Amino acid sequence: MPNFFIDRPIFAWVIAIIIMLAGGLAILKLPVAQYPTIAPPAVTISASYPGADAKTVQDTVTQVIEQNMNGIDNLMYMSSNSDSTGTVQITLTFESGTDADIAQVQVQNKLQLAMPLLPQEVQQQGVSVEKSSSSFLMVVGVINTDGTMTQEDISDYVAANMKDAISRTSGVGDVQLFGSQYAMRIWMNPNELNKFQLTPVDVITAIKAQNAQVAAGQLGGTPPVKGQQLNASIIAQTRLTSTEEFGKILLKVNQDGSRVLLRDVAKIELGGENYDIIAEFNGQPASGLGIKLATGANALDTAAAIRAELAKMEPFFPSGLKIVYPYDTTPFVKISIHEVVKTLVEAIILVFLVMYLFLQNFRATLIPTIAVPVVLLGTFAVLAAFGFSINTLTMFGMVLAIGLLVDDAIVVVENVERVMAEEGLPPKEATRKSMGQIQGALVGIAMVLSAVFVPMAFFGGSTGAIYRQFSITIVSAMALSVLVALILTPALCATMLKPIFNRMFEKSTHHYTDSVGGILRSTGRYLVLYLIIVVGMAYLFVRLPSSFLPDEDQGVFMTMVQLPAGATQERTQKVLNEVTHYYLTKEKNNVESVFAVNGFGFAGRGQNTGIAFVSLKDWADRPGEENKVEAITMRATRAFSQIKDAMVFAFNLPAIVELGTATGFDFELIDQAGLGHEKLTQARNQLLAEAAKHPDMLTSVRPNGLEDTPQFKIDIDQEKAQALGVSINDINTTLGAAWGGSYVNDFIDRGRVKKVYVMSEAKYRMLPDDIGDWYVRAADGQMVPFSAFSSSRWEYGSPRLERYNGLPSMEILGQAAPGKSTGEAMELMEQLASKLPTGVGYDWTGMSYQERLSGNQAPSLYAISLIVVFLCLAALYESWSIPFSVMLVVPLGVIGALLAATFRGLTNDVYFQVGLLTTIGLSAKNAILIVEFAKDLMDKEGKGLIEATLDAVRMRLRPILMTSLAFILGVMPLVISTGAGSGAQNAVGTGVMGGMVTATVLAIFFVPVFFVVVRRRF
């Protein structure tokens, strides 16, 4: 096939221009993102029943919805949480590859069918079904420095003048609000209700039948009467649109024309729909707007457009209102991708330099300089064929594949040069002879590398996509590389190559051949040495930490504050304020801003939690290892242990926000007999105590829930209520409206529909004794206090009740101890769970579910890959024994990478594994080429298995050294990288360099030995 192109170079140039144009077109139509879709599709039903506890929402909302979630296709599992704030979160996780839209629509259809069974308040609030995806493209905070506007005003302004236009920006899949827009709070005063002989139910009824919209009709409407000449629609009632307009609502007139209005017994104002969460930014009040990227969209773009829109909005803002960005990841991904492109360009330049250093012919060095970029461009086209994007994983896979691209070009060009330098042939004949020499070797190498890399794309689970990205971006690169070795390089070597330090290299080569001959004189020692190397490689591989992905200092981190049970919103403050003060006083030069959010947390949503999104300055302003995120979080968590009130921990965001800590499991106890909640807590405590007796394997085994807290139970005497003439419904409505609020109806503020909330004033619903201030009107206009027909006490109840697959459950988290694989800890956990009281089951969720379901498919995939590689090698050569001489070079390339990983303290993560595979592939390529040359010399020339091998290794030494020096020097910046995004590139570079050094320093002394010892064995 290359011989078809040597005499036909214009065709090769044309079909290379096609590849270049396709790559250029695809670069612009490839999306851009920090990461692909890793987590399996999940749909999160969210419901809100205001004022309820965990038990009420579980019994009336969670169970009803869960019992109607049947008939949905490809459902891995579901887990529901019911909080004491009245919120229900049911997350259904589906199979990987399941269409997210279809799953969401099926879930929402089942929810719509189950809606009539839900309480009226839940239906009024609404139940939202939405897909869960990447955390946030960008968090657009809005602050008011002047302090004139409170947080509610800022949130209302954001909801009015920002969400509508930001959503119109291209690439913005959805937007979220960090606050509650305006909503009219009628603040009931029990003293005036008792005075004016009123009750909250009367207020609710008056507001309902004082603000509604009514259909009216038309003048001259059809059917018309004969002679009609006008037709105008009539208007009857409009919703109130002013505070004093609600103030004038008539509640009662008494008997002497009292004319008591709404404002007499209550305060009418504009406030927030929800007061649970208050957000601040460096102390001053603030708001936010969470932004999510669309499914297909640029990350560098569609984030700069948002900044442009905010800049456009800036002049049209109230005085003192400005925009800040406490969280953004566009600069980080931009810098990482720029570093990757710079690394590729540097690799091309150093290949040019080394190839001129070895081959003094300048015109020969331009052949890869043209060939190498083209393949890269083609790779992008292949991505456009498979619908991939410009991910971090894809660019790092291309970085790893550049080493195979460069040596694939160098080998053929060096062979052409060596042919015309040794035989003095014209460039065309020399190129033809060289392409004849390595005609089938390139195809065999391509098949071997495909068999090595394709099976890694078939791993199942969340980790399957991560491996698939690299597998595709490397297999496509190799498939295009073999073509560009058979197409552009021969034509360039023919039409762009003239006909017709060295001394030290010649002296070393002659000395090298003597060393190889001396080694071949006695091959016994070099086989036991190889066995020792293999044993050491196995020992290092078995004893090595494992990880998912290297956590990187993305420029931000988080601080979590967890006040004890029963803490208030103001107790989280002056503790969340101390964190801000510490960050903006003791770390002024490293921390640019902090975004404190109160009452949000991570385990629950109560008032005793909070989180601060600490955003550091630019990496240019953070010199040294002490100003990095890792070295700052430890100092923060050391300085936060002095707080003896809350429990404050500072940590860094994971590389992937979805799944992390691959060494940890996600065990979950299930109650499969209706034992209850106390018995399930006892079983969980027993399991925790039993697991605390095995510190050698299980470490930090903790529950993922909230322990029981005191609650105020009011029991109403039905007989007393009947005797006193007060209805149970009236009492319940009064209590719920006073102490929990009641979303009554809607109104129109400024052309937007806001809610109208009715709730007691703050000072009258604080202490239990305040219940004595509330009276219920009996049938005969008589007020009875709550102290007459009811009693109250304190009892322990759960603040957050969770269920798994429709059964009560308790989530237990933990990690395997160092030196112990996670699968070795899951078996111990499920052995401990087998001695629990009867009726208590167990199950694995999340990452543990993926690990248990996938099983040990990696050894099977490796076995089938090895079988296919052996078959391809036995095809390329003819004898069944020759392929062993190639398959015995893998440990030589693995041992160096293992040494580098151990010395640098790295971890056996995805990047290290892919780099190990790359080194294995390149070493196998070198062995394939050497043994092919040796076999060809033995066959076509009839040499005696010793001079043939020596000649083959002598003529193969130069390309191997050239490619090793070009590729080691091309990844040195990755190894010595210490800037932004220098944990992923360091991890992917150190292992590759370590493997590649020892895959060529000593493999050149072993492949001839392997070939010789195999040949004189069968």
Tell me which residues in 485-504 interact with ligand PTY (CB under 6 A).
Answer: 487
33 binds, among a copy of itself, ligand PTY, none (CB under 5 to 8 A by kind): none
Measured CA to CA, the distance from residue 261 to residue 51 in angstroms comes to: 27
When binding is defined by CB under 8 A, the residue of 45, 299, 591, 901 that contacts a copy of itself is 299
Residue 186 pairs in a beta bridge with 268, 758
- CB atoms under 10 Å from CB of 468, counted, come to 18
Nearer to a copy of itself, 634 or 673 (CB): 673
15 part of the interface to ligand PTY, by CB under 6 A: yes
1 part of the interface to ligand PTY, by CB under 6 A: yes
For residue 414, what are the contacts with CB-CB under 8 A and spacing of at least 6?
A: 358, 359, 958, 959, 962
Nearer to ligand PTY, 384 or 556 (CB): 384
When binding is defined by CB under 6 A, the residue of 69, 475, 735, 801 that contacts ligand PTY is 475
When binding is defined by CB under 6 A, the residue of 158, 447, 869, 965 that contacts ligand PTY is 447
Strands 753-760, 182-188: pairing is: parallel
The answer to whether 140 and 325 have CB atoms below 8 angstroms apart is yes
When binding is defined by CB under 8 A, the residue of 578, 630, 730, 936 that contacts a copy of itself is 730
903 binds, among a copy of itself, ligand PTY, none (CB under 5 to 8 A by kind): none
Name the minimum Å distance from CB 256 to a copy of itself.
14
Name the minimum Å distance from CB 715 to a copy of itself.
8
Measured CA to CA, the distance from residue 911 to residue 904 in angstroms comes to: 14
Residue among 339, 301, 342, 482 nearest 407 (CA): 482
Nearer to a copy of itself, 29 or 638 (CB): 29
171 part of the interface to a copy of itself, by CB under 8 A: yes
692 part of the interface to a copy of itself, by CB under 8 A: no
Across 652-804, the runs of DSSP E, i.e. the strands, are 664-665, 667-671, 698-703, 709-716, 742-748, 753-760, 775-777, 783-785, 790-797, 800-804
Nearer to a copy of itself, 201 or 916 (CB): 201
Measured CA to CA, the distance from residue 666 to residue 102 in angstroms comes to: 28
18 part of the interface to a copy of itself, by CB under 8 A: yes
- E strand or H helix at 958: helix 947-975
938 part of the interface to ligand PTY, by CB under 6 A: no
Residues in contact with ligand PTY, counted by CB under 6 A, come to a total of: 22
Measured CA to CA, the distance from residue 730 to residue 733 in angstroms comes to: 5
Alpha-carbon distances, residue 630 vs 636, 811, 978, 979 (angstroms):
10, 29, 13, 13
827 binds, among ligand PTY, a copy of itself, none (CB under 5 to 8 A by kind): none
- Residue 383, both tokens: 């991505």
Measured CA to CA, the distance from residue 816 to residue 826 in angstroms comes to: 8
Name the minimum Å distance from CB 3 to ligand PTY.
6
11 part of the interface to ligand PTY, by CB under 6 A: yes
Residue 794 pairs in a beta bridge with 712
Question: H/E/C letters for each residue in 370-416?
Answer: HHHHHHHHHHHHHHHHHCCCECHHHHHHHHHHHHHHHHHHHHHHHHH
326 binds, among a copy of itself, ligand PTY, none (CB under 5 to 8 A by kind): a copy of itself
Residue among 707, 656, 619 nearest 38 (CA): 656
The answer to whether 448 and 920 have CB atoms below 8 angstroms apart is no
Nearer to ligand PTY, 483 or 776 (CB): 483
Residue among 993, 927, 767 nearest 444 (CA): 927
Nearer to a copy of itself, 833 or 924 (CB): 833
Name the minimum Å distance from CB 474 to ligand PTY.
11
Measured CA to CA, the distance from residue 834 to residue 822 in angstroms comes to: 19
443 binds, among ligand PTY, a copy of itself, none (CB under 5 to 8 A by kind): ligand PTY
When binding is defined by CB under 8 A, the residue of 24, 161, 696, 787 that contacts a copy of itself is 161
Question: H/E/C letters for each residue in 456-473?
Answer: HHHCCCHHHHHHHHHHHH
913 binds, among ligand PTY, a copy of itself, none (CB under 5 to 8 A by kind): none
Nearer to a copy of itself, 589 or 881 (CB): 881
Nearer to ligand PTY, 876 or 1012 (CB): 876
For residue 966, what are the contacts with CB-CB under 8 A and spacing of at least 6?
A: 347, 350, 351, 354, 355, 406, 407, 410
Which residues ranging from 176 to 215 are in contact with a copy of itself (CB under 8 A)?
Answer: 176, 178, 181-184, 186, 188, 190, 199-201, 203-204, 207-215
- Residue 81, both tokens: 């949480």
154 part of the interface to ligand PTY, by CB under 6 A: no
Measured CA to CA, the distance from residue 545 to residue 907 in angstroms comes to: 5
446 part of the interface to ligand PTY, by CB under 6 A: yes
Which residues ranging from 186 to 205 are in contact with ligand PTY (CB under 6 A)?
Answer: none
521 part of the interface to a copy of itself, by CB under 8 A: no
444 part of the interface to ligand PTY, by CB under 6 A: yes
63 binds, among ligand PTY, a copy of itself, none (CB under 5 to 8 A by kind): a copy of itself
Residue 801 phi/psi, 5-degree rounding, is: -105, 125
Which residues ranging from 269 to 288 are in contact with a copy of itself (CB under 8 A)?
Answer: 271, 274-276
What is the x/- site pattern for ligand PTY, positions 350-389, by CB under 6 A?
Answer: ------------------------------------x---
Q: Which stretch binds a copy of itself (CB under 8 A): 306-314, 464-472, 963-971, 996-1004?
A: 306-314
When binding is defined by CB under 6 A, the residue of 51, 440, 785, 806 that contacts ligand PTY is 440
The answer to whether 565 and 707 have CB atoms below 8 angstroms apart is yes
Nearer to a copy of itself, 751 or 818 (CB): 751
Nearer to ligand PTY, 298 or 476 (CB): 476
Judged on CB neighbours under 10 Å (0-12, 13-18, 19+), 871 is middle
What is the x/- site pattern for a copy of itself, positions 90-129, by CB under 8 A?
Answer: -----x---xxxx-xxx-xx--xxxxxx-xxx-xxxxxxx
262 part of the interface to ligand PTY, by CB under 6 A: no
Judged on CB neighbours under 10 Å (0-12, 13-18, 19+), 785 is middle
* Continuous H helices in 692-821: 718-724, 728-740, 786-789
98 part of the interface to ligand PTY, by CB under 6 A: no
Name the minimum Å distance from CB 868 to ligand PTY.
9
When binding is defined by CB under 8 A, the residue of 507, 511, 581, 713 that contacts a copy of itself is 713
The answer to whether 272 and 180 have CB atoms below 8 angstroms apart is yes
Which residues ranging from 817 to 876 are in contact with ligand PTY (CB under 6 A)?
Answer: 872, 875-876
When binding is defined by CB under 8 A, the residue of 243, 860, 879, 978 that contacts a copy of itself is 879
Nearer to ligand PTY, 874 or 969 (CB): 874
Residue 698 phi/psi, 5-degree rounding, is: -105, 125
Residue among 179, 104, 171, 176 nearest 136 (CA): 176
404 part of the interface to ligand PTY, by CB under 6 A: no
First-to-final CA distance of the chain: 34
- Residue 293, both tokens: 């990227």
439 part of the interface to ligand PTY, by CB under 6 A: yes
Q: Which stretch binds ligand PTY (CB under 6 A): 475-483, 535-543, 569-577, 666-674?
A: 475-483
454 part of the interface to ligand PTY, by CB under 6 A: yes
| Sign of torsion over alpha carbons 766, 767, 768, 773 | negative
Which residues ranging from 16 to 75 are in contact with ligand PTY (CB under 6 A)?
Answer: 18
- Residue 754, both tokens: 């806001």
Positions that interact with ligand PTY (CB under 6 A): 1, 4, 11, 14-15, 18, 386, 439-440, 443-444, 446-447, 450, 454, 475, 479, 483, 487, 872, 875-876
